[PDB]
Write a protein that binds this ligand. Sequence first.
Ligand SMILES: Cc1ccc(O)cc1-n1c(N)c(C(N)=O)c2nc3ccccc3nc21
Length: 272
Amino acid sequence: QLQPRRVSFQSPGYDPSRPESFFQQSFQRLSRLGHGSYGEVFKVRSKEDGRLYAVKRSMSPFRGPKDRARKLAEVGSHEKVGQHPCCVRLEQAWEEGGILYLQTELCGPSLQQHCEAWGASLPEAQVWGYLRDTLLALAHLHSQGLVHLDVKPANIFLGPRGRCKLGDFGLLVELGVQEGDPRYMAPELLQGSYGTAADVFSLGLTILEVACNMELPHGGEGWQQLRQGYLPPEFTAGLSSELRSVLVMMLEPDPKLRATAEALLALPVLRQ
Ligand SMILES: Cc1ccc(O)cc1-n1c(N)c(C(N)=O)c2nc3ccccc3nc21
């Protein structure tokens, strides 16, 4: 019959019998953190060990072999990243009934959620720490030839004491493939050319969005203006000379000239 199988590249409180699924039997749904076409994310306490975790499950069963391989790839991308202080850590993953489950550590609200609740520009002190934490994460990914390709506030999750972690590695590619959010896409991605530089540009717009409380454009003339090498004067007025200068480096239209994550972390302004 149907049974959950581990996905990688047993739990008391769950009996192979009974109609309830492994997720329903071996976990306690505390609350729903999000839901969408991807599926649903729940904050849960596991009947196995009682600790707190976050679990993401796909919406509908696998349509076919390619849909299954695409969904399972996020687990593989998670494992290539390995454990890192600024990366959402995956505990375990399994599949049952054509549904894919990912169990990760529990984190705070997304950077998008957190900015929504405050409804204004974040204090530059918070911005620099978040910029640092994600640059540390990007430097970790880029050192292994991995490109996140979906850096945005929704995929950055806050941690205790003002820290944050990069998450959602569903679009991660290994150099040597999927549609991203156009609001945060690097200019060279339109003409193809994939590289680690794309994440730095995406992170620049995320920081530029959260530090200025500005809504990034999906397309049109405004989309182009953010990629000519200058910042919109209206929103970027409050930026300090240092922050504005770091953003200009990250928003450098030419990927050959754009600063790397390791380079930015070596700048004077960015000090642990
Ligand atoms: C479950 C999961 C799997 C892989 C990954 O990279 C991140 C998460 N994830 C977490 N680890 C989350 C958390 N608050 O701890 C969380 N919250 C989300 C809210 C809305 C939409 C998606 C979310 N996804 C989340």
